Amino acid sequence: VYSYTEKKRIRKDFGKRPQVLDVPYLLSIQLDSFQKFIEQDPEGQYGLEAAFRSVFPIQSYSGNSELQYVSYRLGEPVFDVQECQIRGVTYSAPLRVKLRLVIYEREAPEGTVKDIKEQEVYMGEIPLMTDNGTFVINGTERVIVSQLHRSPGVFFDSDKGKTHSSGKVLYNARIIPYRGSWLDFEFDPKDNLFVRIDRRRKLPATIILRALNYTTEQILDLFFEKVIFEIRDNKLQMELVPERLRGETASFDIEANGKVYVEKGRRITARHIRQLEKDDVKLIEVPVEYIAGKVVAKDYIDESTGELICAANMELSLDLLAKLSQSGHKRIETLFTNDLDHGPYISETLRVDPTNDRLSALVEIYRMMRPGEPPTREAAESLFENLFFSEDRYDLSAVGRMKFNRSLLREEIEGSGILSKDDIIDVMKKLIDIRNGKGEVDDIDHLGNRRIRSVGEMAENQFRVGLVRVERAVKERLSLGDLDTLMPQDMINAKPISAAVKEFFGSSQLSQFMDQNNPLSEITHKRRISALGPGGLTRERAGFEVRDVHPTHYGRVCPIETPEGPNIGLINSLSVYAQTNEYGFLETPYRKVTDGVVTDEIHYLSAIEEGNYVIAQANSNLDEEGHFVEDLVTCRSKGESSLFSRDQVDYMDVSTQQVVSVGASLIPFLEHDDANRALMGANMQRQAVPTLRADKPLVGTGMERAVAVDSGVTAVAKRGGVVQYVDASRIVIKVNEDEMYPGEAGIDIYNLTKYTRSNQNTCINQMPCVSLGEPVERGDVLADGPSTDLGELALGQNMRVAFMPWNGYNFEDSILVSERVVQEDRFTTIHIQELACVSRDTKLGPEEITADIPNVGEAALSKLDESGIVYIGAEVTGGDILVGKVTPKGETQLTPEEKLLRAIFGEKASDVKDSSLRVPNGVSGTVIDVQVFTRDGVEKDKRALEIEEMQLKQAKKDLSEELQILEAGLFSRIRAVLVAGGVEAEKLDKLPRDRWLELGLTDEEKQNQLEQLAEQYDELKHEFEKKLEAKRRKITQGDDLAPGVLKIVKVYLAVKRRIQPGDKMAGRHGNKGVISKINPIEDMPYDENGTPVDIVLNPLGVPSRMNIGQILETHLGMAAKGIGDKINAMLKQQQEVAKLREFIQRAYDLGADVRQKVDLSTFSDEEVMRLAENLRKGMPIATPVFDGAKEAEIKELLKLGDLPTSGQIRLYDGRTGEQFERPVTVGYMYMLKLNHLVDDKMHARSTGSYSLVTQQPLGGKAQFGGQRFGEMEVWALEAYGAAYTLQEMLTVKSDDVNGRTKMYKNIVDGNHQMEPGMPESFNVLLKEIRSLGINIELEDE
Amino acid sequence: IETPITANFREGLNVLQYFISTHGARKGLADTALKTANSGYLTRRLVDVA
Amino acid sequence: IETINKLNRISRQMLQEMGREPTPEELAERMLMPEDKIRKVLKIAKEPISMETPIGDDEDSHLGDFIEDTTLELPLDSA
Amino acid sequence: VPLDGGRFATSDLNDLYRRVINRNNRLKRLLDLAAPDIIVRNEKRMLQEAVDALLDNGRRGRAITGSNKRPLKSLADMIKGKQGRFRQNLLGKRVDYSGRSVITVGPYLRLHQCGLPKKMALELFKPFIYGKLELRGLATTIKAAKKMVEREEAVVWDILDEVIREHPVLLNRAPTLHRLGIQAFEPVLIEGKAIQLHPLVCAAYNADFDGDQMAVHVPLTLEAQLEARALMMSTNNILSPANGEPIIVPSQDVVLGLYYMTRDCVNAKGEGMVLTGPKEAERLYRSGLASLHARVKVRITEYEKDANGELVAKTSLKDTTVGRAILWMIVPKGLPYSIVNQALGKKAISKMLNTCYRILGLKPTVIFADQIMYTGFAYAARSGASVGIDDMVIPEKKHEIISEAEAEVAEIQEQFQSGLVTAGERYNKVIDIWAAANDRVSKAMMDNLQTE
């Protein structure tokens, strides 16, 4: 049923809700981004082929030649991931691209059969992904962080609050392209419409319409609705739709085939418009003054002569109606104007804008584009076609086109790469409808308005940039000259593409280093979603309302995961079950519920599909065989809670464990804690360093099994088998012949490498823990990593907290520890270091490495080799020679006193300088291994022989072992041939193995079989000699080194970092504090058994720091370790296995409403003994998130451990021996060790080297420096009665050279005088003032 | 908005109110992260003339 | 500058034809030049680095740091 | 300057002053020959743009781009912007002799010293133990004293212990938003690589014990020695100007243990028995046959100030306890009996320190506060408080509160369908009902936690 690693040991999971299919693969986001990018597409509208279709084919200006594209392929990598982890030279894979050259003819217009050539043109390098998930770049593993930007779409925004304080509501429209000019439409407070094409200056609305060759009547026909006014010889009669007089005062008597309907002065009410709709009145007699004052639409020309009586956008008068009546134009089509409901504002824009045709519009548009140029037509028209109607220079993001069609309410999800003329009209009509009050302003913080920038999409962007950086020169070389003898191989370059790729992968602010502290922080840094990037959410203009979490982030984005301070919660991380679709949005699964019957099938929902209907939550009570319990079930309706009936429930989630990320959900008691300390828990765990030898934790979740093997830190078995050999450096396996590959025998040899370096200076071991050969299968654990014990994560280890007040030592959130933590190397972390050697050629002499160094005694040279290198494992001390180095010296120019000393004593002091590698304030330790790089031109000179034989021992000897494993089956097949050929049973074991080919049998098929066996042995020898030469060739040629440098010697260290009495280390709920000095086991309290308290915490920290999970976590740890102590007490006697079996069965059936029925009766006796040896140190508990143990279970589970339901049993004093007045809990809980180590941050200086400008006394980490003070400390010291100690800090110890020169002489002679002189930084200030060209002086006193 | 919490930190609360409480927690964290710059520039203003 | 441009064009053509890094031994065998001269020309040609060079994301880490002046000697030697 | 990797470090000012002189020489070459006027005016406004860019580049709409794809920084940007030649090196800059480390909780001492570590005291008092070692004649030259101080013999630590005594050293914590962040104390030789600090004066630092690594600044000269001596000690500046109350008052484990220590209740184990002497009362408490909250009749010797500095002894029958008698034995020769005759808690210790600092003295007030924090650290560890799930309680009233609340919400849902309930009236009704419910929960919790 379960895995064999869970047959070895298993824990208790309560599970008050039944679960469906568990956590998917954790790194599916980072891997699929590439799998959609590198892998070949048959339809080809994906990956690189999208760029190769968008750019290629390229057509030159002459048109006589072009370039065509077919496909691409990838080659095999030269170096492996292990050699690129050890040394590291640009781990990638070369790209192979075939191209064809098409040259047209001069006489024929389409002579494409003139010159057709096919060859290979090199592109550059493309880095692959170590499937574990690390970008391997030159020995330093990295990743890149996924971005979070606003994406191409048409959503709206409101402009209120600060600007336009008169009280005018103004909106705006923003069209978001992908590569081009960002389109902006905004409003005006005097009821107009503005256009800001790539915003620098405002433009009217109708100029972009008149630039598209539009007239006035076409605009008035498309946008406005036209009303025809008719005249029959005496009157004015109109064709009025009756639902148009809403909110208009009637100023005349309405007589339409009956009585007077509406009185003069009465507003049109509901029954009046109802009766006018029922009567179906076609013609309404309106008076003269109603039409006189309106605006006509068409240009009503004269039929007599042809002149313009009235034009468009002209106000009517009393004489104009008489002229139109005498002219015979009885079809006055007056525009319908409704100021309350409709918008006549584009007619006001036509009133403001004086432009008439396209020629008057394009001049103003081209002057708005680039001022300082005479206006032309062809250049402006070509600029318009390349900025608005182009495809190669203007892309529009087909997913964004689908979003355009969704926002404009269309039915076609596909589109072109250019802007059509109907889209602008539709978005202006939508903007007018929003201005009229029919629309709705979309908020920015929707999840449908942000698109995930993954690895592959940003790689597509960088590939497009690097290809536009080459294709211009490609077009120039096509239009350069002759084409017959010129080949396309020497035309397309390979430097800019690969250079842009390597500079983006090694210079971008998102491409940063990893965090090799603990693998949960590794997963955190993997699936991290940032907001800052190439023009994203800059923190200077950070969204004040964007920073607040949106209510649609329920189940998509983890609400609490950020570091406090400058990197505020804008940068987040996605949740557990949520993945990304191929469009680029977030989605989460929900299960199907059909008419109350809860089925099993699940489906994914997008961002815009959540706020439409009922989404149910997991804490509702569910019943057997499908139906519900309570009639009132709370759910989520459009982002709000509601209480309703049964049949309205549409969908439902699977379980609660999803709304937080993995770093929050590893905390089992998050549901009993406040959100602030649960936010603080994430950046308390993600900087934790594991110890040397930790144990199995107590309080975990069931999701520790995922983040394990699914992270990738443990060794994963490929297909299983039987383990043949077990060692602490190498393990092998014998795969069964049923699952064996049909080609040949496959043996999974594991060349595991221990103790590799990290850039956070951590120690990594992968701890081979397997026993002798057991049958293993797919998905097992073979190597427990540096923070895992038996597969699952062992981050730290549990202590015994008795939070009780002490004599001033547990004062304000501090920690008292015992002396038993030092004895068994508990809380011991190992920090290793990396150093390097330099050796560069000079103009007087190259650098050499000799052990013979002048003016150095033999006591410091006895630790070195004959070449001058410290032995492996030699105990180093600060002030010793690490790498011996001589340096050629020039001319000796000294004082005559030292020359007199040289003349008296008589030392020659030849030109050899002492520039050997020494450690400044050397932290002592142990050298791990010395790695020395060699030079192709310079002889290696005797040093790297031993590490060369070590590289030969990790070489072919393992291949010789694999060849011996294959040779065993080969000899078995030879024996199977020789037995079946003839009767040979006693004359084969006595003869040697090599004396078998000389035996000649009869002429039959066994002679051909023996010939094929001899040819197979010769083929195995010929295959062995190839990699026998090839491994030595790779070791020889794998020494690419920086120019101008001869050789580099690496020196490692190992400190092992014992416990200092002041550190930074805490629990999991965010109570960060400082451990005080170590009190012994004698002063600290104890119990009735005699065991002293291990650790003491803050007693008043509990009600003030609002942490509740601490107490029941302590009770669970105490009860579980009491159960483990009862198991140990049963183990102390040679006891019958039957009552132990009953004990384990009752301990697994202790829960009443518990799930996960343990298949316990099928274990053998040795498996029960191994389960007892595993549960020796306590049976661990597993409580899921947002589903906790009720206190009755805690009481009945600690009553099992012989406790009177209190947990506070008789702490005795260690100083006087008395008993306390009220007892304190002596329970057990779980805590972690952090990364903030004491002397790595602590540094202090006395002297050193000074800088250039104001001599700038250097400081920092590993620089031997100190601390300055700002102007705040200046104000603080001027707040006192102190006058010139601040002035001393200003000049004397800072920049006064003669001042500190006199000061050091006063201290070394015992004078203690200050004598202030002149600050040099003020002189630098005076010179910077005089560098401008104005006078400044010092008036003499 | 209408419905408050029903349980407390001891009895255990649900997922919905826990999602609601983040709106008040992280907004206050943003306020105490951003208000210090203005307070510091004001206490710069007051000592600047002096 | 002419010799640097010639060696750059030959190195670009050699990386285009072969497919790996332009090792200067083949350049010395082709252009009949000594190897130390090729090392000297490849070593001299390098653009200097500016005095600001923004490393970190904040506006605190710039130059005027990690570079020291060796003319100002120790006060202990003067004592 | 050449770097360690052979690279060159030049400035952009070199590029500006190179291009200006280049185009000045090109203007000289154009003016020494017959040049067209368009070329001459082109060279002139190029020279104009280059000189005004060398003066201040990048305050108009367009600047010089194409150095390292970053906008260019000129000579005026060292002064004008955030880079700030003034702010970086003129009113505050980098100074020698300092150090910082993690603060560590230990009282361990009297109030005038706070736990400076061993190796930082060796490193920062190093020229001092050259100067006071070369004079006494335990070394020939200072170059031999180099070796004698890196070999680290015990006599070097003896001379260092002679140097460290009577030397108040400044300690400040960034940021210093108030003046009490900087103050001086003299070191003591401890073991470890972490600094320590006096726990009672932590209200003046506004710091919690989690880290942040505050700095230490050493005075050198004798005038700086006296400046660090007189107006830097916390006994000399004890009260802040801003409020009408001092900020060396505690609110901590001291106050919690003192409130547990001065509390009384009528119980068993020797109540109401009369003794003469509070030292006899504390001896009877330490003998074991007593109670900490018992009512014990102790004759209290009460003093009272005269008109010009004398005392009058008045011993009578006063109603007191064991802990109040011990706290009366804490104070030497001072405040009347009405001070100690109340439940001493949060405001009461501030009232005691406020009357003590104002009426009687300065140095007995420092000793009195030191004995307060001593007896607080004693009776806090004597108290031994704890927090469990059975300590905090929630009664059975909460189910009735939730039932009445959901019944009134159901009444709102029934009255909403009548057609006379708007959104604002229902919103105000929900606010009023749930506010009354929260007040009823608060009053029930107060009435159930003050009892039992």
Swiss-Prot record, chain A:
Keywords: Acetylation, DNA-directed RNA polymerase, Nucleotidyltransferase, Transcription, Transferase. Transmembrane segments: none annotated. One of its GO terms (molecular function) is DNA binding. The keyword Manganese does not apply. GO terms for cellular component: DNA-directed RNA polymerase complex. GO terms for biological process: DNA-templated transcription. The modification N6-acetyllysine is found at K1021, K1199. It catalyses: RNA(n) + a ribonucleoside 5'-triphosphate = RNA(n+1) + diphosphate. InterPro entries: DNA-dir_RNA_pol_bsu_ext_1_sf, DNA-dir_RNA_pol_bsu_external_1, DNA-dir_RNA_pol_su2, DNA-dir_RNAP_su2_dom, DNA-dir_RNAP_su2_hyb_sf, RNA_pol_bsu_bac, RNA_pol_bsu_CS, RNA_pol_bsu_protrusion. Pfam families: RNA_pol_Rpb2_1, RNA_pol_Rpb2_2, RNA_pol_Rpb2_3, RNA_pol_Rpb2_45, RNA_pol_Rpb2_6, RNA_pol_Rpb2_7. The RNAP catalytic core consists of 2 alpha, 1 beta, 1 beta' and 1 omega subunit. When a sigma factor is associated with the core the holoenzyme is formed, which can initiate transcription. DNA-dependent RNA polymerase catalyzes the transcription of DNA into RNA using the four ribonucleoside triphosphates as substrates. Belongs to the RNA polymerase beta chain family. This is DNA-directed RNA polymerase subunit beta. It comes from Escherichia coli O157:H7. The gene is rpoB.
From Swiss-Prot, chain D:
The keyword Nucleotidyltransferase applies. The RNAP catalytic core consists of 2 alpha, 1 beta, 1 beta' and 1 omega subunit. When a sigma factor is associated with the core the holoenzyme is formed, which can initiate transcription. Belongs to the RNA polymerase beta' chain family. It comes from Escherichia coli O157:H7. It comes from the Bacteria. Mg(2+) binds at D208, D210, D212. One of its GO terms (molecular function) is zinc ion binding. This is DNA-directed RNA polymerase subunit beta'. Coiled coil: none annotated. One of its GO terms (biological process) is DNA-templated transcription. DNA-dependent RNA polymerase catalyzes the transcription of DNA into RNA using the four ribonucleoside triphosphates as substrates. The lineage of its organism: Bacteria, Pseudomonadati, Pseudomonadota, Gammaproteobacteria, Enterobacterales. The keyword Lyase does not apply. Keywords: Acetylation, DNA-directed RNA polymerase, Magnesium, Metal-binding, Nucleotidyltransferase, Transcription, Transferase, Zinc. The chain holds residues 253 to 704 of 1407 of the full protein. One of its GO terms (cellular component) is DNA-directed RNA polymerase complex.
